UniProtKB/Swiss-Prot annotation, chain A:
Role noted for this protein: Accessory factor for DNA replication. It plays a role in accurately duplicating the genome in vivo.
Protein origin, superkingdom: Eukaryota
Miscellaneous comment as given in the Swiss-Prot or TrEMBL entry: Present with 3280 molecules/cell in log phase SD medium.
Protein name per UniProt: DNA polymerase alpha-binding protein
Shown part of the complete sequence: 474 to 927 of 927
Species this chain originates from: Saccharomyces cerevisiae (strain ATCC 204508 / S288c) (Baker's yeast)
Compartments where located: Nucleus
Swiss-Prot/TrEMBL WD repeat ranges: 226-266
UniProtKB/Swiss-Prot annotation, chain B:
Function recorded in the entry: Required for DNA replication. Functions as part of the GINS complex which plays an essential role in the initiation of DNA replication by binding to DNA replication origins and facilitating the assembly of the DNA replication machinery.
Gene name of the encoded protein: SLD5
Record-annotated disulphide pairs: none
Protein name listed in UniProt: DNA replication complex GINS protein SLD5
Subunit structure: Component of the GINS complex which is a heterotetramer composed of SLD5, PSF1, PSF2 and PSF3. Interacts with PSF2.
Protein's cellular compartments: Nucleus
Superkingdom in the source lineage: Eukaryota
Homology family: Belongs to the GINS4/SLD5 family.
Swiss-Prot record, chain C:
Name under which the protein is recorded: DNA replication complex GINS protein PSF1
Described purpose of this protein according to its UniProt entry: Required for DNA replication. Functions as part of the GINS complex which plays an essential role in the initiation of DNA replication by binding to DNA replication origins and facilitating the assembly of the DNA replication machinery. Required for the chromatin binding of CDC45.
Entry's Gene Ontology cellular component terms: CMG complex; DNA replication preinitiation complex; GINS complex; nuclear replication fork; nucleus
Subcellular location: Nucleus
Gene: PSF1
Residues of the full protein shown: 105 to 208 of 208
From Swiss-Prot, chain D:
Species in which this protein is naturally found: Saccharomyces cerevisiae (strain ATCC 204508 / S288c)
Record's protein name: Cell division control protein 45
Disulfide bonds: none
Location in the cell: Nucleus
Recorded GO CC terms: CMG complex; DNA replication preinitiation complex; nuclear replication fork; nucleus
Keyword Phosphoprotein: yes
Any matching Pfam family: CDC45
Remaining remarks: Present with 1730 molecules/cell in log phase SD medium.
One BP annotation, GO: DNA replication initiation
GO molecular function: chromatin binding; DNA replication origin binding; single-stranded DNA binding
Subunit structure: Assembles into a complex with MCM5/CDC46. Interacts with MCM10.
Gene that produces this protein: CDC45
Protein's job: Required for initiation of chromosomal DNA replication. Acts at the origin of replication. Also has a role in minichromosome maintenance.
Keywords: Cell cycle, DNA replication, Nucleus, Phosphoprotein
């Protein structure tokens, strides 16, 4: 199985002689080939802070990774790498990584204190910001890399194995592992016989794994977005035996609801950045799923839990969702977000300074959405289902509101059951 | 025809337009003495007062 | 009503500047009255011009047909002949109505 | 010594206040490239939100009456190309006041002779010294460096001769002719790329100034044939045509000709300046007024479909000239016609290249309007300069064609008298040069403003651009319109028929120092460019007698 | 004492009452705003919405350190459904953004080169809708009764343009109706 050079959010050439090297929340890096060489132009979204520049390439650097401090270039054939800092304090440096026959650089990464270079045979060579070489480590072949200023996240895959994930940190004294080669059940792309004449064949040839984009969240949670169009977020990463992947977004249901129940395929989702509530994307309209020259304006898309029926939405009728049906989806969305925000503040603390107002508003909407399902259970005379819903309340003021819904529904036995929960929580609080 | 001149609210903010003119009066001068950076917070404050000052300029002339 | 050398209401229609000279004392009794309406405001609000609303804060302005040194207040702008500016908004309002600067 | 990013940030913090901390720039109007460099600098200062003040100065003697009299707290003066030759610090006294000084100018000089004090011994003159010349007279590390500090009867005697050895290398230097080696378009556009601002308007702007020097030198822009190519490909907006977009300003390349302004119009008045091209061959009127009638009146040139035939289906005929001159290539071999060139479009409103575009800017700068007449003459050229600077918007359309229809009569005006002074036969090769004095003809008014005079010479240097295998020396002309015989006399450069190997810049400015140093009997060098001076009527005849013997080439 | 344009507004201040309405942005930057109607924030976070007033954001776009999101009805796939509810209803105009015409003209000066393919489509999809409104307005005024009208959905601009004549015709005919008795 021949490998391919992978980059974050990279697009292939297609039917043109120009393409994008990389793309992220900082900006985008594109190249223009005019019959003999490549012209790399790096443009940013924030014109005020940094200045747009360009240069001529004489080596053909196709591998790139962009962070807040510099730009790293790499060559998959000769093994020559180059790091270019944006500020004028540090000078440029050039070093050539020795590569054997067959072995090629598939993915590169750059942090401000460590340099990560990965190969097709799985050699892990790490360098610092000054160029001092460290110990050489031999592991599984790396096909995908992502980082946000401190850690190394590697994805492994071979011909006699399957997709996995590893989480490590390059400390000052030694390498410490949070997660060591745990299996990742991400679905592989199913190329059929009719795809050989399709116009989207060029995207899968440059990226056989189907990994469109992958990045870390604003609060430190690992995220991945494969070819199955489902956004996966890693929950409970501080505990290796308790780590779980939770799907909180799906593009396949959002396109059908916004288009009025149609079956078109000209609308897609390209992930750029996600800071706990909205995935930034570009609405690409056309046959190709990859962007080209000039980028449209970014839109906002809030996350939604993929829990719907298809036959029930047609009978009840932009497609609109009723009150009663949306209470189940609001309960699932708020429960996942409140648990992750609580563990982040008790272990890492504040990051922006306004986390307490977000947590108070999220916990208030969590108890309010549960009361809508609680009112529906009392109307259908199901006293037993209403008892289990009362135990999921967090705030003490939510238990008082549950009594008033029960008295209005003429259920005196349900009223006394709420008071037993109140006496049990006060006893545990005094221990 | 003419309407009752709501004098009560007018003098209430007529104190305010004196104050923020004096607020930016010192804090620019504090920025000159500290200049041996950000040019945002001056320019917005300068334009915001005069636009409200523009409104009452028309409002008393039509009287 | 007074923006730059007000009482020079001369160089202005001499064949009728004796006509309205009987009306000048009527005219200046507007002008005297318009002064105390400028001062009798308890705060400093302009009543001399600036009727069009402002839009932006940076306006390219050119000059012609004028010379000398003017604008002793709000920083001297050092007006030389036929030389454009690029300034903020509120300064030129007392000069465009004066008729020294020409084009916005 | 001045890294390009450093001076920008340094000049940022020095005047960025919202008061009268006004930095002011100066520019000459006597040069086209001097304009276009400044225009792009202003607009980035707009979007970096700083207050400014722009003043033109047309005269070198005027500089005292525009700076040295009106200053209050200007810390940041800026200037475009004025003092490569004469030292301004000797021209204007500035005493050292308040090592970390209180007011610092820059300079953006574009000329070949430099001034050693302005780079070495820099305390207020922060010049643009970055990777422009790495060999800034590299032998100077001991000449002035031992001139600064200057039994010993035999030792100091040798030491005075070493100073005299240093004296000669400062005597042959500061005695060279001048050009512009590198355009001011090249520097500031490279500076902005170090900052990295992507706008095709900039890429449309910077190529204008280097296009202006296509008629003054040859191999300066021959170095820039790659630097035009890479940028239009690296700043590729699109791979497709993506048609019917009224915006987006698409950039391409198309071939083009010395026969000029064709895409704007007139294959009719091409007939004159086709004979200009045959004035580059062997004639001015005679054979061509037969010879043109094999290649031209082949098609009668219409009235309505000539809006379409010499706009559109002249592409069948540009191809046809393209398949005429390929068989005029191994046989004629005259390669002043086929050229690579550059073009732009606006989505609509016709295709306008940059070859003809510099032509409209020259003529529109010209027309478009004791010692009491020169003041009312000098107030004109500043004013009509001003209506050309705003020509770089889309907002000027029906004034853009005004210069266009102005240009195609001015050449018809200038050729009307050039054919006269030929047939008068008043060019006399005396010994060194040729002298011509236009004592009086018709229409003398269009020779006060000197920008027409270099073009008249540009036509006149090419009448003598035959073989001429001895005496390749340009001319000196003479004309007078106004009182007291002002006589804006000027010199030209010799030319090469596309074969510069010999270092031919100028010899006259060396002699212009000599005659000005003799008697000061009403001679003037108040005009800016050293290639133009003035003379009195009774002094031009002893001028040449001083010049026919003083062989300084 | 203007004495020039008194009975109506000039077209330079009708934009002045609409610029003081807030919309949403995408911020980029990190005291800041004490402008008596401020809501200054801290180090502001990108990839998020915020109700910000308009005129400061236009000034924030000239220094170019933020970006704008268009309002939710500014796609071409949305305006088409407006043109069908009116073409079946010649009685009146159906559904109105209420300040749409002055909103686009501000939005076409470095607020157009941000959005995803609006040229040769959006000015197509607006200038048609201007006249369809004013074709509707020509049939309405022919049906003029005495002292009672029905204008339900009009932009502010046509209100500044129907204004200075619609008064004095019905006012001058108010005399001959009333002074007859």
């Amino acid at each position: 199985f021949r490998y391919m050079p992978f980059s974050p959010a990279g697009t292939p050439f297609g039917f043109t002689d120009r393409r994008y090297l990389t793309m992220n929340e900082v900006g985008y890096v594109s190249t223009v080939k005019n019959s003999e060489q490549y012209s790399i132009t790096v443009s940013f979204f924030d014109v005020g802070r940094f200045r747009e520049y360009h240069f001529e390439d004489l080596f053909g650097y196709d591998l790139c990774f962009l962070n807040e401090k510099g730009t790293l270039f790499g060559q998959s054939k000769t093994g020559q790498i180059q790091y270019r800092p944006h500020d004028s304090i540090h000078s440029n440096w050039t070093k050539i990584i020795p590569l054997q026959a067959g072995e090629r650089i598939t993915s590169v990464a750059a942090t401000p204190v460590r340099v990560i270079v990965g190969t097709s045979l799985g050699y892990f060579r790490s360098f610092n910001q000054f160029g001092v070489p460290f110990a050489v480590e031999k592991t599984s072949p790396i096909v995908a890399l992502t980082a946000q200023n401190y850690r190394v996240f590697s994805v492994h895959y071979s011909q006699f194995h399957g997709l996995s994930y590893s989480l490590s940190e390059l400390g000052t004294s030694s390498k410490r592992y949070y997660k060591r080669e745990c299996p990742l059940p991400m679905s592989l792309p199913n190329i059929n016989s009719d795809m050989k004449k399709d116009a989207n064949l060029d995207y899968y040839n440059f990226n056989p794994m189907g990994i469109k984009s992958l990045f870390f969240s604003s609060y430190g949670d690992p995220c991945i977005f494969g070819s199955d169009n489902t956004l996966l977020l890693l929950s409970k990463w501080r505990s290796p035996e308790e780590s779980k992947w939770l799907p909180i977004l799906d593009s396949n249901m959002e396109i059908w609801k916004m288009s009025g129940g149609k079956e078109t395929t000209d609308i897609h989702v390209w992930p750029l950045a996600l800071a706990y509530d909205t995935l930034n994307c570009i609405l690409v309209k056309g046959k190709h799923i990859w962007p080209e020259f000039p980028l449209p304006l970014p839109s906002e898309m809030e996350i939604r839990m993929p829990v719907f029926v298809k036959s029930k939405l047609l009978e009840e009728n932009e497609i609109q969702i009723p009150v009663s049906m949306a209470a189940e989806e609001e309960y699932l969305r708020s429960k996942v977000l409140s648990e992750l925000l609580t563990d982040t503040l008790e272990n890492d603390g504040e990051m922006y300074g306004n986390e307490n107002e977000v947590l108070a508003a999220l916990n208030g909407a969590y108890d309010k959405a549960l009361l809508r399902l609680f009112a529906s259970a009392c109307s259908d005379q199901n006293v037993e289902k209403a008892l289990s819903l009362a135990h999921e309340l967090k705030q003490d003021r939510a238990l008082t509101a549950a009594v008033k819904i029960s008295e209005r529904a003429e259920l005196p036995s349900l009223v006394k059951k709420i008071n037993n929960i109140r006496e049990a929580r006060y006893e545990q609080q005094l221990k | 025809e003419l309407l009752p001149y709501p004098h009560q609210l007018m003098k209430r903010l007529l104190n305010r337009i004196s104050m923020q003119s004096q607020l930016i009066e010192n804090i620019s001068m504090g920025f000159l003495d500290m200049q041996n950076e950000s040019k945002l917070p001056l320019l917005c404050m300068e334009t915001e007062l005069e636009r409200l000052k523009f409104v009452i300029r028309s409002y008393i002339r039509c009287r | 009503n007074g923006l730059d050398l007000m009482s020079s209401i001369t160089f202005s229609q001499q064949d009728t500047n004796n006509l309205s000279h009987q009306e000048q004392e009527y005219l200046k009794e507007y002008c005297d009255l318009i002064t105390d309406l400028k001062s009798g405001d308890l705060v400093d609000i302009d009543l001399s011009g600036s009727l069009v609303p402002p839009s932006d804060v940076f306006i390219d302005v050119r000059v012609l047909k004028d010379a000398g040194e003017i604008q002793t207040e709000y920083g001297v702008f050092n007006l030389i002949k036929d030389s454009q500016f690029f300034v903020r908004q509120s300064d030129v309002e007392r000069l465009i109505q004066q008729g020294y600067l020409q084009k916005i | 010594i001045s890294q390009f990013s450093e001076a920008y940030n340094k000049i940022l913090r020095n005047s960025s206040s919202h008061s009268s901390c006004q930095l002011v720039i100066f520019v000459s109007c006597l040069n086209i490239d001097a304009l276009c460099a400044t225009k792009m600098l202003s607009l980035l200062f707009k979007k970096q939100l700083v207050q400014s003040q722009i003043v033109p100065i047309f005269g070198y003697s005027e500089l005292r009456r525009h700076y040295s009299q009106l200053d209050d707290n200007i810390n940041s003066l800026l200037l475009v190309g004025f003092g490569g030759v004469i030292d301004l610090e000797a021209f204007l006294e500035i005493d050292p006041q308040e090592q970390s000084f209180r007011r610092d100018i820059y300079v953006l000089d574009a000329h070949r002779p430099w001034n050693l004090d302005n780079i070495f011994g820099s305390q207020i003159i922060q010049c643009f010294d970055d990777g422009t010349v790495d060999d800034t007279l590299g032998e100077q590390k001991e000449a002035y460096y031992k001139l600064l500090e200057l039994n010993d009867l035999s030792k100091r005697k040798q030491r005075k001769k070493q100073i005299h050895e240093y004296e000669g290398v400062l005597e042959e230097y500061y005695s060279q002719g001048t050009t512009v080696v590198n355009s001011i378009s090249a520097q500031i556009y490279s500076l902005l790329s170090a900052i990295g601002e992507t706008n095709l308007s900039n890429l449309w702007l910077n190529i204008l100034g280097t296009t202006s020097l296509d008629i003054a030198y040859a191999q300066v822009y021959n170095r820039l044939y790659p630097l035009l190519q890479d940028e239009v490909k690296r700043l590729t907006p699109s791979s497709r045509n993506s048609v019917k977009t009224p915006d987006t300003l698409t950039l391409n390349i198309q071939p083009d000709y010395y026969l000029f302004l064709l895409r704007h119009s007139s294959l009719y008045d091409s007939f004159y300046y086709s004979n200009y091209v045959n004035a580059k061959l062997s004639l001015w009127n005679e054979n061509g007024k037969k010879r043109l009638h094999k290649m031209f009146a082949r098609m009668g040139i219409p009235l309505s479909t000539a809006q379409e035939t010499w706009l559109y289906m002249d592409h069948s005929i540009k191809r046809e000239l393209g398949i005429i001159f390929d068989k005029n290539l191994d046989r004629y071999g005259l390669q002043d016609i086929i050229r690579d060139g550059f073009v732009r479009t606006l989505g609509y409103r016709g295709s306008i290249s940059a070859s003809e575009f510099v032509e409209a800017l020259t003529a529109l700068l010209e027309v478009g309007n004791s010692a009491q007449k020169l003041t009312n003459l000098r107030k004109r050229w500043v004013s009509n300069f001003w209506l050309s600077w705003d020509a770089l918007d889309d907002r000027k359309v029906e004034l853009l064609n005004r210069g266009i229809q102005l240009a195609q009569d001015l050449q018809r005006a200038i050729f009307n008298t050039g054919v006269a002074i030929l047939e008068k036969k008043l060019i006399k090769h005396l010994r060194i040069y040729r002298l011509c004095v236009l004592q009086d003809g018709p229409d003398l008014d269009l020779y006060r403003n000197p920008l027409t005079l270099l073009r008249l010479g540009n036509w006149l240097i090419e009448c003598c651009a035959e073989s001429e295998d001895k005496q390749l020396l340009p001319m000196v002309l003479a004309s007078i319109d106004e009182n007291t015989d002002t006589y804006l006399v000027a010199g030209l450069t010799p030319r090469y028929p596309r074969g510069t190997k010999k270092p031919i810049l100028n010899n006259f400015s060396m002699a212009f120092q000599q005659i000005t140093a003799e008697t000061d009997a009403k001679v003037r060098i108040d005009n800016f460019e050293s290639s133009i001076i003035e003379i009195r009527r009774e002094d031009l005849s002893p001028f040449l007698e001083k010049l026919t013997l003083s062989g300084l080439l | 004492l203007p004495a020039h344009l008194q009975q109506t507004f000039s077209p330079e201040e009708i934009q002045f009452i609409v610029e003081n309405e807030p919309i949403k942005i995408f911020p980029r930057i990190t005291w800041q705003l004490i402008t008596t109607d401020d809501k200054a924030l801290n180090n502001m976070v990108a990839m998020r919405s915020t109700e910000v007033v308009l005129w400061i954001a236009l000034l924030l776009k000239q220094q170019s350190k933020c970006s704008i999101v268009a309002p939710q009805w500014l796609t071409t796939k949305e305006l088409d459904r407006k043109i069908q509810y009116e073409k079946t209803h010649p009685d009146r105009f159906s559904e109105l953004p209420w300040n749409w015409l002055v909103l686009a003209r501000i939005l076409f000066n470095k607020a157009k080169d941000d959005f995803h393919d609006p040229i040769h489509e959006l000015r197509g999809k607006i200038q048609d809708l201007r006249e369809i409104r004013q074709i509707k307005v020509l049939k309405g005024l022919k049906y003029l009764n005495e002292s009672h009208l029905q204008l339900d959905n009009l932009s502010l601009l046509e209100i500044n343009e129907l204004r200075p004549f619609i008064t004095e015709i019905m006012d001058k005919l108010r005399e001959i109706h009333t002074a007859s008795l």
